[PDB]
Ligand binder design. Structure first.
Ligand SMILES: Cc1cc2nc3c(=O)[nH]c(=O)nc-3n(C[C@H](O)[C@H](O)[C@H](O)COP(=O)(O)OP(=O)(O)OC[C@H]3O[C@@H](n4cnc5c(N)ncnc54)[C@H](O)[C@@H]3O)c2cc1C
Length: 440
């Protein structure tokens, strides 16, 4: 009787949790596929992750699923020791990957500042604003101020030179997958807290280990455990929600009565659903503003075998580009992240060549691909990232729902929020527990 909207990782893991508890459920998915913003598909001659790629054993929820579904040894590190190139004052500088990582590491020290005072338990991000907070008032003041400051201004104010500013600009265009200047620095500080406050750990967690058999090995694994068939091609159009239950109406007009609704539709796509009663004003403000998630991910194929890393600041088409696969026909597939989905066509060879031309004039693009999640009606965003003010008055507001409508998804997680499948698996599971505990 529990209706789960969406067959991404949050909805799939919530269904499995309800199944463990003996609670009847149904998953309604708009697309003709499961996985959501995780999507492994053959393109350009090999399986490519069009969304979600990297994992780590320090991500508890993701790692448990890797172990459950047989993928313990089926991980491979992305290429390292690349020849690095970065754009700073309109010019290309060359160096080793170590040289670049050394500059980023120094900048991260200032970027993380305060994380040890804010996040002693990095899974209690709002402890500073709780009644259990016992530190000095200046820590709470700085915490609130940091929600209104972007991560680049922290580096500027610390006196780093233009080269380092341009490097962190590029870095956070990728990390905020959007304009980093509108973002909340508290997001970066919590990533530090979850990464033992070390840049190398943060990159090991978010940008190193890939699944040989893809995210699909995990999402197909969860779906394979479910005893109730997923209803594909069944978009939800309306959710009526009250203290005792809910009523869901699909696009086709079908009415489904529910004891509770677990809604995993991300903010970028919530406007497709009519909520009755209307969602609270503070939650609607977040939906209207969005998340800071307007960027895009590309896969580019070039001739030859090239160990390449490139960084470029806003407003570049792509801000971080790295070699990922060396193919058997003397080509290299590279991944790229850019701040602005509308400034690049992910499937245009000319735009992909323009990306590579940001750093070199001697590399030739032969193929390119990607899926523009921001222009996907059922997503409307890449991974969720925080605008100024959204660390303290954003993601946590979706819990302030008195009715039997529950919001679950990576974007509302306490831990690796938005950026990681770990957050979807966390919040899908704990939202199922909210439903279970209420019924018990
Ligand atoms: C480009 C990109 C790269 C990423 N890389 C990584 C990475 O390297 N590592 C990592 O850990 N994470 C990564 N992620 C993040 C990861 O993909 C997400 O955190 C996670 O997949 C989100 O899961 P979810 O279940 O919360 O939401 P979703 O996956 O968005 O699931 C929501 C589901 O609801 C469906 N839906 C939407 N509207 C409706 C409707 N009206 N009715 C019915 N169904 C509907 C959608 O089709 C979708 O299937 C990346 C994300 C992106 C966008």
């Amino acid at each position: 009787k529990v209706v789960i909207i969406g067959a991404g990782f949050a909805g799939l893991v919530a269904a499995r949790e309800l199944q463990t508890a003996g609670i009847e459920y149904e998953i309604l998915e708009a697309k003709d596929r499961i996985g959501g913003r995780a999507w492994t598909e053959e393109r350009m001659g090999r399986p490519l992750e069009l969304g979600a790629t990297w994992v780590h054993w320090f991500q508890a929820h993701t790692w448990t699923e890797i172990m459950r579904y047989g993928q313990r040894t089926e991980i491979t590190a992305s290429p390292s020791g690349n020849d690095a190139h970065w754009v700073t004052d309109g010019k290309v500088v060359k160096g080793t990957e170590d040289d670049l990582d050394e500059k980023l590491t120094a900048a991260m020290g200032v970027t993380y500042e305060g994380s040890e005072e804010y996040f002693p338990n990095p899974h209690d991000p709002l402890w500073v604003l709780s009644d259990d907070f016992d530190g000095p008032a200046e820590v709470r003041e700085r915490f609130l101020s940091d929600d209104q400051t972007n991560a680049i201004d922290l580096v500027k104010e610390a006196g780093f030179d233009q080269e380092t500013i341009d490097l962190v600009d590029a870095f956070w265009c990728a990390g905020y997958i959007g304009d980093p200047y509108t973002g909340s620095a508290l997001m970066a500080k919590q990533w530090g807290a979850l990464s033992d406050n070390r840049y190398r750990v943060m990159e090991d967690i978010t940008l190193k280990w890939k699944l040989n058999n893809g995210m699909r090995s995990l999402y197909d694994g969860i779906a394979g455990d479910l005893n109730t068939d997923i209803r594909l091609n069944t978009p939800v159009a309306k959710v009526e929600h009250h203290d005792n239950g809910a009523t869901v109406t699909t696009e086709s007009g079908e009415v489904i009565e529910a004891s509770a609704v677990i809604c995993t539709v991300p903010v970028g796509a919530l406007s497709n659903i009519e909520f009755s009663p209307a969602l609270p004003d503070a939650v609607q403000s977040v939906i209207d503003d969005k998340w800071n998630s307007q960027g895009a991910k590309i896969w580019i194929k070039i001739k030859g075998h090239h160990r390449f890393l490139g960084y470029a600041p806003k407003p570049a088409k792509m801000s971080v580009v790295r070699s990922e696969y060396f193919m058997d026909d003397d080509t290299t597939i590279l991944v790229g992240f850019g701040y602005d989905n509308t400034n690049i066509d992910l499937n245009s060879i000319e735009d992909a060549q323009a990306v590579i031309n940001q750093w070199r004039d001697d590399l030739e693009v032969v193929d390119t691909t990607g899926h523009n999640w921001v222009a996907d009606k059922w997503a409307g965003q890449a991974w969720g990232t925080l605008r100024k003010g959204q660390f303290t008055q954003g993601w946590s507001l979706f819990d302030d729902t008195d009715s039997q409508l529950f919001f679950a998804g990576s974007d509302y997680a306490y831990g690796w929020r938005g950026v990681s499948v770990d957050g979807a698996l966390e919040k899908g599971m704990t939202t199922a527990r909210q439903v279970i505990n209420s019924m018990r």
